[PDB]
Amino acid sequence: STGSATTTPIDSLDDAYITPVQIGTPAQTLNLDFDTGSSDLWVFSSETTASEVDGQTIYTPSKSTTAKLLSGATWSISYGDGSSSSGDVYTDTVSVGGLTVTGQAVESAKKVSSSFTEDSTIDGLLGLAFSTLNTVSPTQQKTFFDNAKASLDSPVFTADLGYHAPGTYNFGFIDTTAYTGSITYTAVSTKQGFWEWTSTGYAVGSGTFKSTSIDGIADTGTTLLYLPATVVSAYWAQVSGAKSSSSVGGYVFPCSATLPSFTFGVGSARIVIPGDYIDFGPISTGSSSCFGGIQSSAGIGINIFGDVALKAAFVVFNGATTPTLGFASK
Ligand SMILES: CC[C@H](C)CNC(=O)CP(=O)(O)[C@H](CC(C)C)NC(=O)[C@H](Cc1c[nH]c[nH+]1)NC(=O)[C@H](Cc1ccccc1)NC(=O)OC(C)(C)C
Numbered sequence: 001s002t003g004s005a006t007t008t009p010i011d012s013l014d015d016a017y018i019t020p021v022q023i024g025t026p027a028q029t030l031n032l033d034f035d036t037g038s039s040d041l042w043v044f045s046s047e048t049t050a051s052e053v054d055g056q057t058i059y060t061p062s063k064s065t066t067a068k069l070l071s072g073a074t075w076s077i078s079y080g081d082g083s084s085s086s087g088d089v090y091t092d093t094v095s096v097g098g099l100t101v102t103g104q105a106v107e108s109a110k111k112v113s114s115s116f117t118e119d120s121t122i123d124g125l126l127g128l129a130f131s132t133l134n135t136v137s138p139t140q141q142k143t144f145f146d147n148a149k150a151s152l153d154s155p156v157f158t159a160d161l162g163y164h165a166p167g168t169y170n171f172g173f174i175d176t177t178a179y180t181g182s183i184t185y186t187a188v189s190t191k192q193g194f195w196e197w198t199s200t201g202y203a204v205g206s207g208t209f210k211s212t213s214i215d216g217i218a219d220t221g222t223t224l225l226y227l228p229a230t231v232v233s234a235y236w237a238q239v240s241g242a243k244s245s246s247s248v249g250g251y252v253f254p255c256s257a258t259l260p261s262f263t264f265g266v267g268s269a270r271i272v273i274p275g276d277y278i279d280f281g282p283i284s285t286g287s288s289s290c291f292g293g294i295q296s297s298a299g300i301g302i303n304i305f306g307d308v309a310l311k312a313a314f315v316v317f318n319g320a321t322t323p324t325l326g327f328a329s330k
Contacts, residue, residue, distance in 0.1 A: 001151045001210065002172040003099025007161065010121040013281045014307060018162055019169050022095040022108055022287070024064030025060060027259035030057050030123040036159070036317065037219030037304075039133040039143050040077055041094070042085055043124030044116075053111050055120045056093040061158045063106065067090070067092040068103075070141075075107045077135045080222070080300065083113040086326040089136055094144060098213075099171050101148050120191050125132035128157070128317065145171070145319060155319040157323055159220055160330070161311040163277055167313055179314035179328035183268035194219070195317060197325050199305075200267060202227075204235050205260030216303030218315060218325055224280070225262075225273070226281030226297035226304040234292050235262060243290065248283055255282055262294060264309065273312040280308070 007019040018031040023043070030043055033139035043054055046060040061067040068091045076086040089112040094104040110122070116122070127134070127143050134140040149155045152172035160178055161167040168175075174183075189196040214227065229320035232251070236242045238260045242253035253259075259275030293308040316326030 001099055002109065002153050002170070003095075003097035003148075003157070005097030006166050006289050007169050008166045009162070009164065010119075012162060017167065017220070017307070018123075018124065018178050019096070019126070021126060024061075024092050026064075027095065028057075028059055028064065029077070029120065030059060032124050032126040033122050034126050034128060034220060035045050035219070035221030036128040037217060037221040038076065038079070038125060038126035039063050039129045039193070040107055040130055040135055041105065041124070041126050041144055042075065042077070042087065042109055042113065043174045045087075045108045046111045047087060049111050050126075051275070052117045052212075054117050055061075056123045058123075059106065059108065061090045061092070061106075064092055066102075067106075067305070070105065070136075072199040073139070073141075075136045077264045081115065083115040085109045085112045085116065087111070089141065096144065096316060097169070099145055099148060099152075103145055105136060105142055107136065107141075118303045128197060128220070130193045132190070140329045145317075148172075149319060157309060157317045158317070159315040159317065161220070161307060163274075163311050165313070174188060174316060179330045181329055183316055183326040183328040184266045184315070185316075186267050186326050190323065195323075200265030201268070202231055202265065203263040204238055205275075208263065209263065211265075214264070214303055215304050216297075218305050218310060218317070220307065220310060222304045223308065224304075224305035224306045225278075225294045225308045226300055226302075226306065228296060228303065229296040229298045232294055232296045236292070246289065248289075250288050252283060253292060255279070255288055255290040266304075269310075269327065271313045271327055271329065273309060277312055 078084040194217040203209040314328040
């Protein structure tokens with residue numbers, strides 16, 4: 001079987017993308033943030049502390065005939081930006097773009113941090129990294145992808161995120177009409193539990209490609225592109241009004257400028273991010289200063305190929321026994 005769902009940016013800046021998910025019987029549609037940097041499927045629900053719920057849509061396990069409480073199981077997760085959530089777990093039918101999985105673990109939030117309450121458009125997250133990062137205790141639960149692998153026509157899922165436009169998430173098949181040229185695959189290390197790979201180098205604008213190993217993770221749940229401080233400094237050195245701003249927290253530049261492109265290597269292939277994808281947007285509505293899409297990963301402790309990077313390509317998350325990552329220009 002296969003599944004195909006449209007994913008849309010939550011705002012005009014492409015801060016995150018939401019994809020509709022059907023949970024329970026009859027189906028309860030929630031808009032989730034598909035995250036390749038985490039492994040938990042959690043949602044706001046009838047159990048979440050009332051005062052911590054904004055206008056998000058909640059899952060009511062009591063209204064679903066197929067919901068089953070997973071006795072004794074609890075969960076607690078903290079993300080890179082400091083947000084967190086926790087609760088109990090239920091198993092229920094979950095469908096994404098026509099692909100249905102039964103007995104999928106749906107983690108019910110009892111409490112959520114301030115940033116989640118504040119984001120009215122995100123109803124929860126759907127983890128797509130390796131099941132080893134799942135926070136359910138005492139026994140970890142499999143991700144939606146791991147549970148679907150048996151029925152998938154092919155153990156794969158593709159990410160085709162749009163630039164200021166909708167995109168698509170497909171499960172079990174590769175849409176040959178969605179990209180140009182051929183897909184180049186690169187090995188993945190599951191040691192840290194992420195979709196971890198090593199880039200072959202980079203190039204700024206129309207300059208020279210520098211062969212240097214860049215170990216990073218493909219994470220659809222992170223907005224920006226975080227690279228080593230020296231590579232980021234080399235990029236910004238090509239933008240005359242750009243500077244590192246301690247108050248804003250990163251490189252900023254005149255919205256006025258035409259940014260050079262940024263190329264990253266995948267084995268022998270090259271993925272080019274258009275300079276405009278690097279212009280995230282004004283620091284404030286009406287400001288003449290814009291926030292850069294490429295920032296230093298020095299403080300994160302790890303390089304992350306976020307949305308700004310991923311949206312410039314067609315990405316294939318190949319989940320076979322020995323997983324691999326494929327990238328194609330589009
Ligand atoms: C089991 C623990 C796992 C290893 C946790 N995994 C992670 O924290 C990585 P993630 O991709 O799952 C996680 C998902 C988010 C929805 C919280 N992303 C993050 O934690 C990163 C912050 C970060 C990561 N690393 C260093 N800093 N968040 C982000 O990148 C958020 C995403 C977002 C935007 C808008 C609305 C909702 C969500 N965007 C963001 O911060 O954008 C600006 C930099 C412009 C402010």
